[PDB]
Design a protein around this ligand. Structure first.
Ligand code: HEM
Ligand code: HEM
Ligand SMILES: CNCC#Cc1cc(F)cc(CCc2cc(C)cc(N)n2)c1
Ligand SMILES: CNCC#Cc1cc(F)cc(CCc2cc(C)cc(N)n2)c1
Ligand SMILES: C[C@H](O)[C@H](O)[C@H]1CNc2nc(N)[nH]c(=O)c2N1
Ligand SMILES: C[C@H](O)[C@H](O)[C@H]1CNc2nc(N)[nH]c(=O)c2N1
Ligand SMILES: [Zn+2]
Lengths: 410, 413
């Protein structure tokens, strides 16, 4: 069936047909919906029709379905899944698969940009040193002195599971987290385990509040190897407030490049277990989640302190107030430093416009309301009132297990 | 379909285990291939359909009172069975009616207030025959529930559906709302959400004050007859003028709201019986007024004007001027209600209470259906605990359900 979705602020209805192409499960059933569950729990035979499907839609996107090039490519790929138990994507197929995996990313509010993706082929990589070189170039290229650019670096695909390339850092740039004897936590509490793994691998912690973690890179299934990203490549922003001059006295900085490196890019049944990818920040990512989550940098109490706010009852909304000012400061700081950043108002607008685009040109657009709606001021952004359908289109980015839980050390 | 599903809180690491989902009934609208989790809304029952629905609810009731399989239990089954067989329907005992209503609330995935589910005053209005009588019942409901500002949750249940052509309906989507008036120049006065309903009332004979905050009359339908207009006595409608603990100019905005939130357009289903008129009411979460009623674009849209008197940079959206005004407005709403000692809960306290409720439910009941999209507050989501809480959504019965707007289905006499 065709399926409709309504905006309840504008009463616009859209018709979704694209969902007829999904296959991967959502995690729901008729009886139970798991829309708020963050993670719902190949051979010659399995791989080919997946390969067939992806090739088919590639040659369908470039208006050559059934062409000679297409037919032979199907043969070329079949012959190769026989005699290697896998196959290699053409360069044009790599780029297309990467952009469409971003276009299919239900949880990403930035997808208006999906076709502007710089794709770095690192499938010739063989070592962690190789990986580090590739990642440094990625970082430098995508940072671009504050004028950020979207990029993905794709390393060798999985073969047998034993010989997997992995970036072990969940993201390319993060701040260390230190477990104090006195119970509390220095740095970023979300990372503390990873930070400990780096110390245990030989990293020398400065034990500051904002210590860029080293890269931990695994190439072809071997022990990961530590590498320090050259600091000149790691662009950072001091957070100040345009009215509160005491705000700089808080000591807050964040990095400019958001870059996710723990995910699995899947194209034509092939699995790229290492594919760090980056864009630019929506302010709330930093101002709300990183800084204000109780399990994170947790500064709300501190900020409300300097704002002299009455903090005895919840109903004074002191937490709310402090939150808004923290985010004003983050948006201000990046803007002041000509570092690319988007506010949640602008970003959500863009995504509603992008949805329109996809429904019109593509017949639907899988979106995850839970993730798309910003973590503050929800209903005063336009996607709150926007019904969305969620379904899994492929190529996609998938979660994969943390490497330190599957690795056989040496 | 697995026997034990697990949900995680990502802030606290707490994992909970859900078994109650096994007792799921109707569809969510979701499938293996697609999720309708953010979709707002994804001729009677036969004898054969009603029996297993009745026995289901009846078994459940005698299970709750720890008399499952007892004599009284089998006797009740046999009596209901007989009644459905002969009269094509059946009547609920008062005890069952009351259990059923509290459980429809308990089962309501979109309600963050469910920690109060067992404190519910049920008014049995199934002896009602006329709209005048419906008006009487609803007035008593409002007075009891309002309680001079010390609100109390209540539901009034009117007679169940019979053939389909004799439904009792409150035509008001809620008991107390403000009129909306479309103007010739396309502007709107009052509450822009209620324009359609306001025009219906005016047609039915209402003389509109054409104001910003005009409490609508009730439009009531008894036994499938044409609805009738009644004016709620003003002394029964408790109201709160909005002021700010700091900004003395806030009161100059001329804003106020009513104290009693009371949903009247839903259908209550118990043991396969359909109660098409069952107005129920509790108390407000501050954000319902301060964020949605006051700041939704298609509603009272006061953000711009509030921002103006706050003197905020309104040219750059990255100044977050909207966000700044929103907090202050919800600060004023909460403040105004507390001062007039009218019961209201802030989104922080409510969501925390609900996490404690949900945890208790998992403990004693093996689950607690919840609709994350509705449960998370429309401001400051992530700084409230429910944001980080994985939930599972499924339909347990007894339940509140949506039903068509009656003006779209009514056959005019
Ligand atoms: C270019 C600017 C971009 C913006 C403003 C943006 C915005 C966002 C935000 C705010 C999130 C939520 C992150 C979180 O809550 O952890 C997200 C998620 C995501 N984005 Fe984007 N994004 C951008 C670029 C990209 C790019 C370049 C890719 C891939 C090539 C991408 C793919 C994804 C994926 C797969 C997720 C899901 C992350 C997860 O599941 O943990 N995005 N995006
Ligand atoms: C006692 C205080 C209560 C509080 C604080 C509370 C809170 C809320 C809130 C904030 C919502 C979202 C409303 C919206 O955005 O439209 C809601 C929805 C709902 N509540 Fe409660 N509620 C309370 C009592 C009740 C009672 C007594 C019942 C039924 C017996 C009930 C059943 C429901 C239902 C069925 C919904 C979904 C409404 C819909 O689908 O439009 N609630 N509640
Ligand atoms: C799954 N939740 C835990 C987390 C996390 C996280 C941490 C970081 F240090 C950076 C990002 C970046 C997320 C992101 C990715 C992209 C491509 C763009 C963007 N704006 N944000 C996420
Ligand atoms: C379906 N979405 C549109 C709507 C609406 C609505 C309008 C109103 F004037 C009052 C309430 C109150 C909702 C509610 C019910 C109960 C029982 C408690 C509570 N706090 N809020 C809802
Ligand atoms: C349990 C729930 O799914 C979880 O808290 C989600 C909610 N929405 C989110 N939305 C974004 N953008 N990022 C997140 O990490 C989350 N977390
Ligand atoms: C499309 C989306 O489902 C819709 O805007 C929902 C979002 N969550 C909500 N949550 C509550 N409590 N009330 C609402 O009206 C809505 N609206
Ligand atoms: Zn679902």
């Amino acid at each position: 069936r065709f399926l409709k979705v309504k905006n309840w602020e504008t009463e616009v209805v859209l018709t979704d047909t694209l969902h007829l192409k999904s296959t991967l499960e959502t995690g729901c059933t008729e009886y139970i919906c798991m829309g708020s569950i963050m993670h719902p729990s190949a051979t010659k035979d399995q791989l080919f029709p997946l390969a067939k499907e992806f090739i088919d839609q590639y040659y369908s996107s470039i208006k050559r379905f059934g062409s000679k090039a297409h037919m032979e490519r199907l043969e070329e790929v079949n012959k190769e899944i026989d005699t290697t138990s896998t196959y290699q994507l053409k360069d044009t197929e790599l780029i297309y698969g990467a952009k469409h995996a971003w276009r299919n990313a239900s949880r990403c509010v930035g997808r208006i940009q999906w076709s502007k993706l710089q794709v770095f082929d690192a499938r010739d990589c063989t070592t962690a040193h190789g990986m580090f070189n590739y990642i440094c170039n990625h970082v430098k290229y995508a940072t671009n002195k504050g004028n950020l650019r979207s990029a993905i670096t794709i390393f060798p695909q999985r073969t047998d599971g034993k010989h997997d390339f992995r970036v072990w850092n969940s993201q390319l740039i993060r701040y260390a987290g230190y477990k104090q004897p006195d119970g509390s936590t220095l740095g970023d509490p979300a990372n503390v385990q990873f930070t400990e793994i780096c110390i245990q691998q030989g990293w020398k912690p400065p034990r500051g509040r904002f210590d860029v973690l080293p890269l931990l890179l695994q190439a072809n299934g071997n022990d990961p190897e530590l590498f320090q990203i050259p600091p000149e490549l790691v662009l950072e922003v001091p957070i100040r407030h345009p009215k509160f001059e005491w705000f700089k006295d808080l000591g807050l900085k964040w990095y400019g490049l958001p870059a996710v490196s723990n995910m699995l890019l899947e194209i034509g049944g092939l699995e790229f277990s290492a594919c760090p990818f980056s864009g630019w920040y929506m302010g709330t990512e930093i101002g709300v989640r990183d800084y204000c989550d109780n399990s994170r940098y947790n500064i709300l109490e501190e900020v409300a302190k300097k704002m002299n706010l009455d903090m005895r009852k919840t109903s004074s909304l002191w937490k709310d107030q402090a939150l808004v000012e923290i985010n004003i400061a983050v948006l201000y700081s990046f803007q002041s430093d000509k570092v690319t950043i988007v506010d949640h108002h602008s970003a959500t607008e863009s995504f509603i416009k992008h949805m329109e685009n996809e429904y019109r040109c593509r017949g639907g657009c899988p979106a995850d309301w839970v993730w798309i709606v910003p973590p503050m001021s929800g209903s005063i952004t336009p996607v709150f009132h926007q019904e969305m359908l969620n379904y899994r289109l492929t190529p996609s980015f998938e979660y994969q297990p943390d490497p330190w839980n599957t690795h056989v050390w040496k």
